[PDB]
Paper text:
MDHAR reduces the monodehydroascorbate (MDHA) radical to AsA at the expense of an NAD(P)H molecule, with NADH being the preferred donor. We report, for the first time, the crystal structure of MDHAR of O. sativa L. japonica (OsMDHAR) to understand its detailed mechanism. Structural comparison of OsMDHAR to other proteins, using the DALI server, indicated that it has the same fold as that of putidaredoxin reductase (Pdr), biphenyl dioxygenase (BphA4)18 and rubredoxin reductase (RdxR). All these proteins consist of three domains: an NAD(P)-binding domain, an FAD-binding domain, and a C-terminal domain, as shown in Figs 1 and 2.
Except for the crystals of apo OsMDHAR and the OsMDHAR-NAD complex, which have one molecule in the asymmetric unit, there were two molecules in the asymmetric unit of the crystals. The residues participating in the van der Waals interactions with FAD are Gly13, Gly15, Ala122, Thr123, Gly297, and Ala319. Lys53, salt-bridged with Glu178, participates in hydrogen bond formation with O4 of FAD, which is also hydrogen bonded with the carbonyl oxygen of Pro49. The conserved residue Asp298 forms a hydrogen bond with O3’ of the ribitol moiety and the phosphate group is stabilized by hydrogen-bond interactions with Arg48 and Arg147. The Glu41 and Glu148 residues are hydrogen bonded with the O3B and O2B atoms of the adenosine moiety of FAD, respectively. It is involved in the formation of a closed and narrow active site pocket with positively charged residues, which only accommodates small molecules such as MDHA.
Numbering used by the authors: 4 to 435
Write the structure that this text describes.
């Protein structure tokens, strides 16, 4: 049995950013442990569907450990040993008893704590969850952690020049479809929703991306689902059977159909809402001294005055920092202010890259040049409600442009003249 004053359960983005904040807050050797099922120290997970998959000059650990994806210092394994923060890796916790402050591993070792930060993130929804025949076939792959990324890069090499089907139409599907096309596969994306990234993109933003993708040669099948997967005599996938009747040949299937927060360990022990563990503005759960951060947390989003749960890397970083600040504040009796996050999401694929800030609520206007055949695409959109801007999206922005739309989203300026807005959208944002 090992005991630590502070235990972070999980070794992902929030964990890493929490450890950096504990360092900043003066954690001492022997106080903090991070327990992770992964075999490696915390890393910037968005690289797994971006540089990890590049056919040249690919991202590889230890390059993309935290905190370099935000421009911070890199926290190698030796950084945690130098600080006397114990990294307990390749350790899956399979039971948590909050009353006794005890975690148990799959092999039966126990760990106790005084303060617990739940930073377990999400697991992916699987094709078995849709009851799909043949979901269990080989070469049907998911992408959440670096072990998954290595299996994908190995299949890319094994099946080079083949056919790939990507199931899903959110931003993981978009990034995967683009990765496989860049790695020289024939690619088809399949999803039921009426356009890609339907929880964020408008039909007009989506039509840009869908057009750009088809111009790159990616096929897009919307309005259907897979109902089966054919497999050969080795159990390896060979074809995807769709509800619309089409049969797509496939050497590799890669799935991005969403995730689920990893809250099962705590079911019945903490209050839950919106698919997550409910927290206050300091990331403390219904059990004192147990906090929940990142993808699992359902928290008060101060600027919207509503409880929300978000799966954004920026929030994993910032909520981690907030929870450690709150922990340390309570020790010293020093106050900490309520978390005040501005939603920030981004994605990249091919040569494109977009950023979104604020809330996708209201009616939209598009600005700039949304011809997908442009040399250097650059266009955005505003979400307007009650005559003010609530959300902003930008593809192809400079740093100052991105900062300006972030300031629009944060400040919610009023719109006088829509035709001016639309004709000079970024100038609008720069004057704020
Ligand atoms: C492939 C990919 C690409 C992404 N791209 C972007 C992007 O471009 N932009 C963006 O804003 N966001 C993106 N995200 C989302 C972002 O990475 C997540 O929001 C962020 O990782 C959440 O951080 P977290 O610490 O809450 O969870 P995670 O980073 O998932 O960390 C959870 C950690 O806990 C471990 N763990 C879980 N259960 C246990 C257990 N019982 N025992 C031990 N350890 C356990 C996991 O193995 C993992 O180490 C992407 C995510 C993925 C998967």
């Amino acid at each position: 049995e090992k005991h630590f004053k502070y235990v972070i359960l999980g070794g992902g983005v929030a964990a890493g950013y929490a450890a950096r904040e504990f360092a900043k807050q003066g954690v001492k050797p022997g106080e903090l442990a991070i327990i992770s099922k992964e075999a490696v120290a915390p890393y910037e997970r968005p690289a797994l569907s971006k540089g990890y998959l590049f056919p040249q000059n690919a991202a590889r650990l230890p390059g993309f450990h935290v905190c370099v994806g935000s421009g911070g210092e890199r926290l190698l394994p030796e950084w945690y040993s130098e600080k006397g923060i114990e990294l307990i890796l390749s350790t899956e916790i399979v039971k948590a008893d909050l009353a006794s402050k005890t975690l148990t591993s799959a092999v039966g070792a126990t760990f106790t704590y005084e303060i617990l930060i739940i930073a377990t993130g999400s697991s992916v929804i699987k094709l078995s969850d849709f009851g799909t025949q043949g979901a269990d076939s080989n070469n049907i792959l998911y992408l959440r952690e670096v072990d998954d990324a290595d299996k994908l890069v190995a299949a890319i090499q094994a099946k080079k020049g083949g056919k790939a089907v990507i199931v899903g139409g959110g931003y993981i599907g978009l990034e995967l479809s683009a990765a496989l096309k860049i790695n020289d596969f024939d690619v088809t994306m399949v999803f039921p929703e009426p356009w890609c990234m339907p929880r964020l993109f408008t039909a007009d933003i989506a039509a840009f991306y869908e057009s750009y993708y088809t111009n790159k040669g990616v096929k897009i099948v919307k309005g259907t689902v897979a109902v089966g997967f054919d497999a050969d005599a080795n159990g390896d996938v060979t074809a995807v059977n769709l509800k619309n009747g089409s049969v797509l040949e496939a050497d590799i299937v890669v799935v991005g159909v969403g995730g689920r927060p990893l809250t099962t360990l705590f079911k019945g022990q903490v209050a839950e809402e919106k698919g997550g563990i409910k927290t206050d503005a300091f990331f403390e759960t219904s059990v004192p001294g147990v906090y929940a951060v990142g993808d699992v947390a359902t928290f008060p989003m101060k600027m919207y005055n509503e409880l929300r749960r978000v799966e954004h890397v920026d929030h994993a970083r910032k909520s981690a920092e907030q929870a450690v600040k709150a922990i340390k504040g309570k020790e010293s009796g020093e106050s900490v202010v309520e978390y005040d996050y501005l939603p920030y999401f981004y994605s990249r694929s091919f040569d494109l890259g977009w950023q979104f800030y604020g809330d996708n609520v209201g009616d939209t206007i598009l600005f700039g040049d949304s011809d997908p055949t442009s040399a250097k695409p650059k266009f955005g959109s505003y979400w307007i409600k009650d005559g003010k801007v609530l959300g902003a999206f930008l593809e192809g922005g400079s740093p100052d442009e991105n900062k300006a739309i972030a300031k629009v989203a944060k400040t919610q300026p009023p719109v006088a003249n829509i035709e001016e807005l639309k004709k000079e959208g970024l100038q609008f944002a720069s004057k704020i």
